[PDB]
Each structure stands twice: as C-alpha cells, then as structure tokens.
C-alpha cells in the first residue's frame, strides 16, 4: 500500500483559483497578444473548481483577472503563509498560456514552474510533505493536438 | 527529509505546444472533466492520479472537430503518497 497524504484538516487547505477572463490588457499591452481573446466560460471553471473543492473541504480563494504581477503577489501570500494546519494546497490557474507559461490578463507571462516552485518545501515549509496541487487550465501553445484513430 | 520538490501534482490541461479548449458555455475541457472526476471519484476514495488518468481519458475523447483538434492533459507529479480528497 502506498502511503496516503493526510487529508483530514478542515479546511484541507486553500484552493487558490486564479481565474483569468479579461485579456483586454494583454491585447493592449502585448503586441503578440493583440488578438488574444477573453476566456469566456472560465467563470464556469472557477465555479466548478470552487464547488468541487469546497466539497473536498478546501477553502476556495478565487482571484479573477490577475495580471502576472498580481498572480505572483497572490501566490507569494500563499507561499509565505503558514499552512501548518492545512493538509494540502491547491492552485488552479485558468488563463491563456503558451509553452510552459500562463498569461496574466496583462499578457505578461508567468512560467508555470515559476508558479509551482513557489511552494517547494523550502519556499513553503508549512506545506512540506503535503500535496501541492496545481491545475493549469491554459493553452501551452497554439498547436492543435492531433487526433489519431484507435 | 524529503525532496524540496516532492509532493507536487501539476495537472496540465494540455501537453506542451498545444491549445487546451474552453467552451464558453461549459468551461474548459480539462477543468470540467477534472471537477466531474473529482466530484465523482473522490467520494469513492480514488486518488488524484487515478482521477487525472480519468481526466486524461475523458479529455482525450473530446474533439475540436473544426481543427481536427484534440487535447491531451498531462499531469506531472512528485507525489510520494496517494493523494485522496476524502470527506
């Protein structure tokens, strides 16, 4: 039997939801994103994540339309805070993205690794030994994943 | 002691280089599948990797017919234990 992460604290931990919908800033500020679209429907993801993780006893921490700097600042708080009484940390990023990065609504890039690395045992010892879960709902490029018959 | 980067689960909606899909009316393939799976399987005590596998399965079955497009979520993990989200 594998060990199982303790998952009994109430709440289990924070489920941060960075929910990026409005990319007007990106469109204004980043030439290559001039036509990047708002992420209509993302609210439904946020809602789904919220209800799902509430059910799982996470304290949902939504942040809408975060520029990259705001994302880092929000994440910093979670990175810095004391999760000792938490059993888990979940961060959902719903945004546009490209290879390895997610976009702030300002069209700035946040390398996913830059995000997740904020929660290493060193960065966030109170989460040491505790599951840190990041769900990244973003493109990771503009390629269409091809389908193959099976 | 455990590694600095232990106990991470990264649930990517898509493998690198590729789009992930968002239905403005329903949410994203990935997140919706994830939540569906979590809601359905966590009470069953299914661990997250099993769930993400199901997500992979589910999302893999979705099609962007216009572009003959697929989406392949891709979890990466350094979880050292089963990650379950119990009641």
């Amino acid at each position: 039997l594998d060990k199982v992460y303790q998952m009994k604290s109430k709440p289990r931990g924070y489920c941060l939801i960075i929910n990026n919908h409005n990319f007007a800033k990106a469109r204004e500020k980043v030439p290559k994103l001039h036509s990047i679209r708002d992420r209509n429907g993302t609210h439904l993801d946020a809602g789904a994540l919220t209800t799902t993780f509430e059910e799982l006893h996470f304290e949902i921490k939504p942040h809408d339309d975060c520029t990259v700097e705001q994302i880092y600042e929000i994440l910093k708080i979670y990175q810095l805070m004391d999760h000792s009484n938490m059993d888990c940390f979940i961060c959902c990023i719903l945004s546009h993205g490209d290879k390895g990065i997610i976009y702030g609504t300002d069209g700035q890039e946040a390398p996913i690794y830059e995000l997740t690395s904020q929660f290493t045992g060193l960065k966030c010892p109170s989460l040491a030994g505790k599951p840190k879960v990041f769900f990244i709902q973003a493109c990771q490029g503009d390629n269409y994943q091809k389908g193959i018959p099976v | 002691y455990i590694p600095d980067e232990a106990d991470f689960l990264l649930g990517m909606a898509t493998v690198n280089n590729c789009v992930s899909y968002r239905n403005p009316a329903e949410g994203t393939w990935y997140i919706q599948s994830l939540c569906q799976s979590l809601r359905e399987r966590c009470p069953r005590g299914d661990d997250i990797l099993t769930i993400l596998t199901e997500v992979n399965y589910e999302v893999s079955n979705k099609d962007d017919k216009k572009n003959m497009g697929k989406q392949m979520p891709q979890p990466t993990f350094t979880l050292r234990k089963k990650l379950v989200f119990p009641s």
Partner: peptide, 4 residues
Amino acid sequence: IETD
C-alpha cells in the same frame, strides 16, 4: 469552442 475556444482555445486558451
């Protein structure tokens, strides 16, 4: 359907 849209892409992120």
